[PDB]
Amino acid sequence: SIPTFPFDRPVPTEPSPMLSELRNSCPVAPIELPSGHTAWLVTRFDDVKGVLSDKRFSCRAAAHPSSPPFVPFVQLCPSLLSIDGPQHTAARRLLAQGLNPGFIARMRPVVQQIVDNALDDLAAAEPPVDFQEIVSVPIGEQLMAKLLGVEPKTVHELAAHVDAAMSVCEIGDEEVSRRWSALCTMVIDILHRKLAEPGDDLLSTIAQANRQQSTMTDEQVVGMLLTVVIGGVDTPIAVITNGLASLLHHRDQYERLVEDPGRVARAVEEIVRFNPATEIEHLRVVTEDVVIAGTALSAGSPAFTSITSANRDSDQFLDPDEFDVERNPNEHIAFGYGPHACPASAYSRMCLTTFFTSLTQRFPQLQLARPFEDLERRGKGLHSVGIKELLVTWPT
Ligand code: HEB
Incomplete structure (x- = not known):
């Protein structure tokens, strides 16, 4: 039968094995959501980019109540x-x-x-x-x-x-x-x-500009602000934490940042590629009959992409399952693709670079406190794949 979502993660900070299984067998695979509805998951790099930039896969239809x-x-x-x-x-x-x-x-x-x-x-x-x-x-x-x-x-x-x-x-x-x-x-x-x-903050500038431009209703602004809050708190926390777990497990990668802080910016690109904050993206619903990678999807089909799987595709990255903070070129889509690509990608890159530069400079001998095999996912039923805790130690 078809696999059920959420997928298992024997290694919480790594992608579910199911992703590679589907990537190497079916480019548009049926999956069973917890609500029982069947959806189709796209896992290959080229295909994921096409779907995310294909307006026939609409988030609006996914928001429709009838949609799963x-x-x-x-x-x-x-x-x-x-x-x-x-x-x-x-x-x-x-x-x-x-x-x-x-x-x-x-x-x-x-x-x-x-x-x-x-x-x-x-x-x-x-x-x-x-x-x-x-x-x-x-x-x-x-x-x-x-x-x-x-x-x-x-x-x-x-x-x-x-x-x-x-x-x-x-x-x-x-x-x-x-x-x-x-x-x-x-x-x-x-x-x-x-x-x-209004104060000196991002929200105030957007609220003032909208009030002057009269382009969004208060309910639409709240909807946008809700998206910023839901996507701007847990995701950076999960990438930083899970990213550090990968840096301390593949300890030679942490040491590379210690050795040359000028390369932390490049390492952040590999961190976001290697440690996505979700297993699959938000739901899309096909509005017309389409054919994607040889698979026909009729109008109304629920569809999912997996940036997590795409960023491990061996057609786009050499040794994709290896964590290599010196990887360059590194043409990932960790911040999404198409109209819904992350609006905070520049802000997030600056934030992660600031953090990992300071951490590696102040704690060059940081280590995992307990075995890497003891890490646990915070909530399997959550969209996020953040881990429960990351116990660390350092020489005192
Ligand atoms: C502040 C705020 C914020 C922040 C910080 C962030 C951070 C982040 N992010 Fe972001 N995002 C967001 C906000 C955000 N975000 C939003 C709001 C969105 C949505 C957009 C649209 O939809 O248009 C996104 C979106 C997004 C996406 C897409 C999804 C889909 O398509 O489904 C992705 C992939 C991402 C990622 C990310 C990352 C990786 C990070 C870090 C690391 N993002």
Whole structure:
């Protein structure tokens, strides 16, 4: 029979073996979602790029109530992953206006200070300690706090509801809706506060520009902001943590960064290629009859791509399952492809480069505290593949 999603991960920080199995047997494979509906998964690099840039695979149709469920937030609000066409383009323009090059430059010292303080907390601790609880989670929460113009504690409360918003089959049906309502109320209240008293933050600049341009309704802005919050907290945390786990397991790769900090930028490209934050992408629904890689898909078929699998495709990368932070050229699609490609790719690259430069400079002899085989996935039923904890140690 056909395989069921979520797939197993005997190694939590590595892709599910099912991905390579399908990649080397069927380019468009049927899979059974937890809701029972059958969907088709695309796993090859060239094919994944084609689907993500093929407007016949629409996120809007995936947000339609009749469409099968995957992540609740997509069907509960006009998220950026719930729309297409001119409506989506207009929202991305506004977001791109806020994430302008001047904004990135101004954020460089802000990120450096957040990284410094988190690493100050690590150095002051007595090893072993959970790197995730002490460093990456505070960093991810405090970065989003700067984007939203709120206090770090406020983002911590928001993050509690993010798991429900991205729950494929982890959280109960009743608690999802109650945690979703709380998440919406928080974001709604934040937006209204910033509209009344805009500050020096990304959210305020977008809210002010939209108010002047009168191009998005308040509900559409909330939908976009919800997407930013859901995608901007857990994903950086998962990549940093899982990425570090790979760096400390393949310990010779961590040492390469210690040896030459000028190559950390290149290493970040390999980190995002090698440690994606999800197993498959958000749901798409085919709107017309199409033929993809010799496979016919009728209108209404639910479709999934796997950037995780694409970034391991031996047709695009030499020795794709090897972690090589010096890999160059490295033409991955870790930040997506097509209209829904990550709007924060430049911001995220700067953030990860700042962090891994500082970490490797201050903790050159960092090590895994316990065996690599003891790592566990935080939540199999979550869209994210972040691990439960990463215990590390260093000479004292
Ligand atoms: C702040 C905020 C933020 C941040 C930080 C981030 C970070 C990130 N990210 Fe991002 N994203 C986002 C926000 C975000 N994000 C959004 C909102 C989206 C959606 C867009 C659209 O849809 O249009 C995305 C999208 C996206 C995608 C696509 C998906 C699909 O298509 O389905 C991907 C792949 C990614 C990745 C990523 C990474 C890798 C990172 C790091 C590392 N992203």
